[PDB]
Amino acid sequence: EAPAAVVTGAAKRIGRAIAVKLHQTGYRVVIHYHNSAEAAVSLADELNKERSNTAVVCQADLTNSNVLPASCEEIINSCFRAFGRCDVLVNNASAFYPTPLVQKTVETQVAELIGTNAIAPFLLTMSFAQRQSNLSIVNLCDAMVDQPCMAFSLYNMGKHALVGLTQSAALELAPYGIRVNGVAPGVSLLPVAMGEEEKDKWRRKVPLGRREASAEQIADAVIFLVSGSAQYITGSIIKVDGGLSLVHA
Amino acid sequence: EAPAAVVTGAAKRIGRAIAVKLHQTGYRVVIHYHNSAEAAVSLADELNKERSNTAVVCQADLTNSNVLPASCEEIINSCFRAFGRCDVLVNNASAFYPTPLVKTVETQVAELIGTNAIAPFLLTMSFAQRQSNLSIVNLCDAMVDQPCMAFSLYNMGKHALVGLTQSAALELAPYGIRVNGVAPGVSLLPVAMGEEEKDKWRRKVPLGRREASAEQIADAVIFLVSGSAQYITGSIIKVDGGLSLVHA
Amino acid sequence: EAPAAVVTGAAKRIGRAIAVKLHQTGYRVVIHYHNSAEAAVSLADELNKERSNTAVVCQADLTNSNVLPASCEEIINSCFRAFGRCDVLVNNASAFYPTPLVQKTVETQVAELIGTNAIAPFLLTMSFAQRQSNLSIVNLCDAMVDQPCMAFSLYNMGKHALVGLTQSAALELAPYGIRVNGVAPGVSLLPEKDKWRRKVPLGRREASAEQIADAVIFLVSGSAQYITGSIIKVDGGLSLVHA
Amino acid sequence: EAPAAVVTGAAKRIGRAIAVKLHQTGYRVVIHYHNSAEAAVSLADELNKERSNTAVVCQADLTNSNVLPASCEEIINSCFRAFGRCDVLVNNASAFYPTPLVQGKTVETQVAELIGTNAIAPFLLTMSFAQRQSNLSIVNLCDAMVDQPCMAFSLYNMGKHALVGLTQSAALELAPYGIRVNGVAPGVSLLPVAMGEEEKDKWRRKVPLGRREASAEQIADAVIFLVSGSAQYITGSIIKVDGGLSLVHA
Ligand SMILES: NC(=O)c1ccc[n+]([C@@H]2O[C@H](COP(=O)([O-])OP(=O)(O)OC[C@H]3O[C@@H](n4cnc5c(N)ncnc54)[C@H](OP(=O)(O)O)[C@@H]3O)[C@@H](O)[C@H]2O)c1
Ligand SMILES: NC(=O)c1ccc[n+]([C@@H]2O[C@H](COP(=O)([O-])OP(=O)(O)OC[C@H]3O[C@@H](n4cnc5c(N)ncnc54)[C@H](OP(=O)(O)O)[C@@H]3O)[C@@H](O)[C@H]2O)c1
Ligand SMILES: NC(=O)c1ccc[n+]([C@@H]2O[C@H](COP(=O)([O-])OP(=O)(O)OC[C@H]3O[C@@H](n4cnc5c(N)ncnc54)[C@H](OP(=O)(O)O)[C@@H]3O)[C@@H](O)[C@H]2O)c1
Ligand SMILES: NC(=O)c1ccc[n+]([C@@H]2O[C@H](COP(=O)([O-])OP(=O)(O)OC[C@H]3O[C@@H](n4cnc5c(N)ncnc54)[C@H](OP(=O)(O)O)[C@@H]3O)[C@@H](O)[C@H]2O)c1
Ligand SMILES: CCc1nc(N)nc(N)c1-c1ccc(Cl)cc1
Ligand SMILES: CCc1nc(N)nc(N)c1-c1ccc(Cl)cc1
Ligand SMILES: CCc1nc(N)nc(N)c1-c1ccc(Cl)cc1
Ligand SMILES: CCc1nc(N)nc(N)c1-c1ccc(Cl)cc1
């Protein structure tokens, strides 16, 4: 039978491209979404038009709270309910906004930024492992974590914690045959709210091509990590950043 | 006038040695503690016997919760109320216990990610908002990239603290606040640990086959807050006897 | 036309596996060797039996010396002469032995360890770029570079230098569309063996040269067109394991 | 009896600052130099005027060659010859110039100079320091920007990366001998003498902490900490002294 993957935040942008490319590869997919119901449903319909019964949606808020463990367990359970197995988890969903140190509550910001970027990946990892071929987890990291944007402390803290998770889970889950790796974009699809002049400023920084990564280029690295061509790779984080992280101030 | 410092988890072990050394250097100290009230008060009394009105205690749980921002604002405020200034913040307090992937898990998240990362972040916000050689020192972990098995939430917290160190160094540089870390390998070993297990850790350390004293950790904190470190920000100094360089 | 690749130290072990997989992928290949002429020619015979005139050999000593720049220019030129193009350079050749700090001359050891592991990759990079589509260079790094083996100072130095070359050349050659990346094995083909295997988290799977070659195939592919300056560890998780 | 230190490339700039601060701390010093004879002697005269017989000069080219091991052995021997002991080695001397990958000295001369001064001579001096053997240590002058390198400086960057590898490998292997091995990694400190003020200001404006380069004494302060008793458990560590520069994105 066909393997099955969960992709978080899969309705739009990079998560959509990952879900598409996994499906093209032969996976059945759970399209997790939070607010983007119409886009999630439209994607599942597109994938099911290609092969019936190969895509479902699953709604969840991945903000940290006392029920986040239950929500994460339910996302994994939704893959077993639909497809009878769960071979790949892709932790893609992520909040991003500034949290300046000097002048939503700050605890809501902690819950959203650390919850989506770190705690939900951790809880999803627990539930993936507990509910258990070529099993693997891919975490969407950030190649610029050590040269961060000013005023983004909580986002940066969350992405650093996700590197720690990737490493710790690779070590702990290797005996169960589950590999755990990361893909670290530099700039890929730019923020919807960002003006054209600012987008071009970011583009001009990238050595390879002076352009952002497509979503498909990011997804290409995810497909490699889940493939049989990566069977001895665990704990690794692949930068897909066009050289951006090597550029000095 | 004498500068003042806040040290979190200062009643015992490394945080106690840091508070002692800061005091010996000339700082007035806030000794934060959670459960260890008798040891925090005994330290305060020792330091005030050495020089009157130079130490106070401040109790707080640094577990993450809806009240943690207020608690961290109150720790910093305690230094201003006692001493009229707050020049140094040492984020030392830390929960450490296994969280296997295969207390509720959300309590473990609150304790391990709150003490190791969120409380340092909120303390950093409160310190900066209240603002000469100002600096913050974060107690990191030199083994964060070769972590102990089954310690994912602790490791996640310590990685998040590296990110805070860097992000806060960059954002607080314009205000003249330096932000750095000290990363022990093994220093004071857990008190429950049998000597046979302690000796196994000691044997791994290239430099002397022995754990760091708390005082050796504190010496790196004293350097980073001193005028000999005035250009250092965003740096994490390993104090690990070469342990992180040892392969499996 | 089919793209072409140079693989250094391609007669045996990892380099041989890389050459085979590039050839299977559709590359024409230059098989570099120093001492292993019989194995280089045996490999070329196997590859040419599959597709005629798709594999040649090239002899060079990659020890640093006054003639190393000309040797490296000749390896690159051999690819252009055989195949009319040179799309991929894999810097695989490497010397490995201990050089204790406290007690071949030490300067011969510098020439071999630093020359084969770092300087010849630098000179090959220069010649590859100067003679220039999906162009890329892949350097064989070491996943244990920051947890080095005791008494291997010069080997470790040269592998660190190779990381610096990977990064510096990625930046400088990006405007030319040449990507520069690394693959960092941990324990692959062993030179006591069991001791090492039991420490690898993914130790249920034997380490293989083909697994290393798979990462090289990804990095040279169109699936890696935005990837430059990246070093992929292929080590079963070994570098995550504390002492 | 006062401890003794060797500082390479100590006639001017950062290496002079390091020699001066070690001397102020109580060390006797060997001021190594290559071409800067007048500045080396000037400095040793100043230090000797402060306390007699506490500074000597030693001349040596640190370019790689088949004689480099003998030169490095001789530098260490000069410390024992003058002072009877050698407690600290500071590997400061360093060539720096561009070596573009795509197109005067031959490339092999550039290799010998850039990799010799930045890496091979530190390795040979480390071997001779250890063989000739309490608070013994080595400090290597690294570069905080080694992972965000300047365009066209590949050989310099390769040499600094190799020096990180040496720092770590020598820390591990020399720990049983009680010799600590650490690094200090400037971002921008004293700017090139050839650089125009406009270009210097471009660099200064990038630095978060103060929008200025490190003084030479700020770099020396980190060296003095690492050789001190306050660092007695620290080995294999590289301290950035960079004002936050390495944290700044493109
Ligand atoms: N784009 C880049 O250049 C870039 C650069 C560096 C790293 N990355 C990483 O790559 C991944 C994909 O980036 P992207 O730009 O495609 O991300 P994005 O568009 O900013 O976010 C992806 C999705 O995350 C989901 N999400 C946000 N908050 C959530 C919450 N509270 N609960 C559950 N889901 C939530 C949202 O789903 P709904 O729309 O359904 O609400 C959203 O569509 C992220 O991890 C990002 O950090 C991207
Ligand atoms: N010891 C080592 O070898 C070592 C190795 C690597 C890193 N480090 C780091 O170095 C720092 C000091 O280490 P240590 O061994 O001295 O630490 P420790 O003894 O484990 O803990 C220090 C103090 O943290 C406070 N703490 C724990 N949970 C708390 C909470 N919920 N709220 C507030 N405070 C809390 C406790 O204060 P009360 O007693 O008052 O409750 C405790 O005494 C830590 O950050 C540790 O991670 C140490
Ligand atoms: N095996 C592993 O586990 C492992 C681990 C970490 C990193 N790596 C990296 O992976 C790559 C391939 O490793 P491997 O074990 O397959 O290497 P290997 O067999 O030790 O050597 C590869 C080839 O390099 C060539 N070589 C050595 N010294 C030379 C010189 N002076 N001039 C020219 N060529 C020379 C030799 O070719 P000839 O036989 O023709 O003379 C040799 O067959 C290396 O860069 C290595 O450092 C491997
Ligand atoms: N300045 C900075 O901003 C900065 C930034 C990053 C790293 N660093 C590192 O910090 C250290 C000191 O920097 P600096 O700017 O003071 O260095 P520098 O002025 O460029 O060079 C220091 C000395 O190196 C000696 N040297 C050069 N080539 C030599 C050779 N072939 N043989 C022997 N000695 C040789 C020269 O001695 P003579 O004059 O006697 O010939 C020179 O005075 C260097 O390792 C540098 O890489 C500095
Ligand atoms: C808002 C898009 C976004 N979402 C998430 N989850 N993470 C990010 N790192 C970004 C991001 C992308 C490009 C730039 Cl230039 C800045 C931030
Ligand atoms: C329990 C002491 C402790 N507390 C905290 N906060 N962090 C740690 N990293 C440790 C610790 C020290 C030595 C060993 Cl061997 C293991 C863990
Ligand atoms: C001789 C094989 C070899 N050659 C080179 N060129 N580099 C290496 N790192 C090794 C190697 C492989 C396995 C072990 Cl355990 C140690 C070293
Ligand atoms: C020429 C001074 C110099 N010498 C050496 N040995 N290394 C360096 N890294 C520099 C240097 C300092 C500042 C700038 Cl901006 C650029 C280079």
Enumerate the domain spans of chain A.
Answer: 4-246
Which residue owns the Cα nearest ligand 4 atom 11? D92
Please give the structure tokens belonging to residue C221: 């592919």
Ligand 4 — pocket residues by CB below 6 A?
D 9, 11-15, 33-36, 61-63, 92-96, 113, 117, 141, 143, 186, 188-190
Q: Determine if residue B208 is left, alpha or beta; phi over 0 gives left, psi from -120 to 50 gives alpha, anything else beta.
A: left
CA end-to-end span of chain B, whole Å?
Answer: 50
Q: Which residue has the tokens 């070994």?
A: C238
* Strand order across the B28-33 sheet: B55-59, B28-33, B4-7, B88-91, B134-139, B177-184, B236-239
| Catalytic residue flag (residue A142) | yes
| Exposure letters B136-146 (e unless 16+ CB within 10 A, then b) | bbbbbbbbbbb
List active site positions of C: 142, 155
Task: Identify which ligand lies nearest to the alpha carbon of B183.
Answer: 2
d(CA B170, CA D245): 9
Cβ(A121)–Cβ(A91) below 8 Å:
yes
Question: How far is A169 from chain C, CA to nearest CA, in Å?
Answer: 11
At residue C139, what is the residue type?
N
Q: Which residues pair with D29 in a beta bridge?
A: D5, D55
d(CA C9, CA C93): 4
Q: Which among A154, A160, A167, A95 is positioned nearest to A125, based on CA atoms?
A: A167
Q: Could you please state the CATH topology (level 3) that the domain comprising A4-246 is classified under.
A: Rossmann fold (3.40.50)
CATH architecture of B4-245: 3-Layer(aba) Sandwich (3.40)
d(CA D18, CA D190): 13
DSSP string, C12-74: SHHHHHHHHHHHHHT-EEEEEESS-HHHHHHHHHHHHHHSTT-EEEEE---S-STTHHHHHHH
- Which chain A residues contact residue B147 at CB under 8 A? 164, 167-168, 171
Positive or negative, the Cα torsion across D135, D138, D141, D142?
A: negative
- D24 at interface of B, judged by CB pairs closer than 8 A: no
* Residue A146: closest C-alpha in chain D: D247
- Which chain C residues contact residue B244 at CB under 8 A? 147
- The full length of chain B comes to 248
**Residue C84: partners with Cβ closer than 8 Å, 6 or more residues away:** C1, C4
87-106 in C: which are within 8 Å (CB) of D? 100-103, 105-106
Task: Identify which ligand lies nearest to the alpha carbon of B231.
Answer: 4
Q: Which among B121, B68, B120 is positioned nearest to B93, based on CA atoms?
A: B120
d(CA C207, CA C187): 7
CA end-to-end span of chain C, whole Å?
Answer: 50
Other beta carbons less than 10 A from residue B190's beta carbon: 10
The SS3 of residue A145 is coil
d(CA C91, CA C177): 18
Resolution, in Å, please? 1.3
**A-C C-beta contacts closer than 8 Å:** 102
**Residue C45: partners with Cβ closer than 8 Å, 6 or more residues away:** none
* Residue B128: closest C-alpha in chain A: A102
Which residue owns the Cα nearest ligand 2 atom 24? B93
Does the annotation list A127 as a binding residue? Answer: no
- Which chain D residues contact residue C105 at CB under 8 A? 66, 69
- Which chain C residues contact residue D124 at CB under 8 A? 106
Q: Which residues pair with A179 in a beta bridge?
A: A136
At residue C205, what is the residue type?
R
Q: Which among B213, B201, B191, B157 is positioned nearest to B16, based on CA atoms?
A: B213
Q: Reply yes or no on domain D4-247 having CATH 3.40.50.2300.
A: no
d(CA D157, CA C111): 19
Does the annotation list D48 as a binding residue? Answer: no
Which of D148, D206, D248 is closest, CB to CB, to A246?
Answer: D148
| Catalytic residue flag (residue D27) | no
What does the radius of gyration of chain C's CA atoms come to, in whole angstroms? 17
Q: Which residues pair with B180 in a beta bridge?
A: B137
Domain C4-240, CATH among 3.40.50.300, 3.40.640.10, 1.10.1740.10, 3.40.50.720: 3.40.50.720
- B245 at interface of D, judged by CB pairs closer than 8 A: yes
3-state secondary structure string across B48-117: HHHCCCCEEEEECCCCCCCCHHHHHHHHHHHHHHHHCCCCEEEECCCCCCCCCCCCCHHHHHHHHHHHHH
Question: How far is A239 from chain C, CA to nearest CA, in Å?
Answer: 6
- The full length of chain D comes to 250
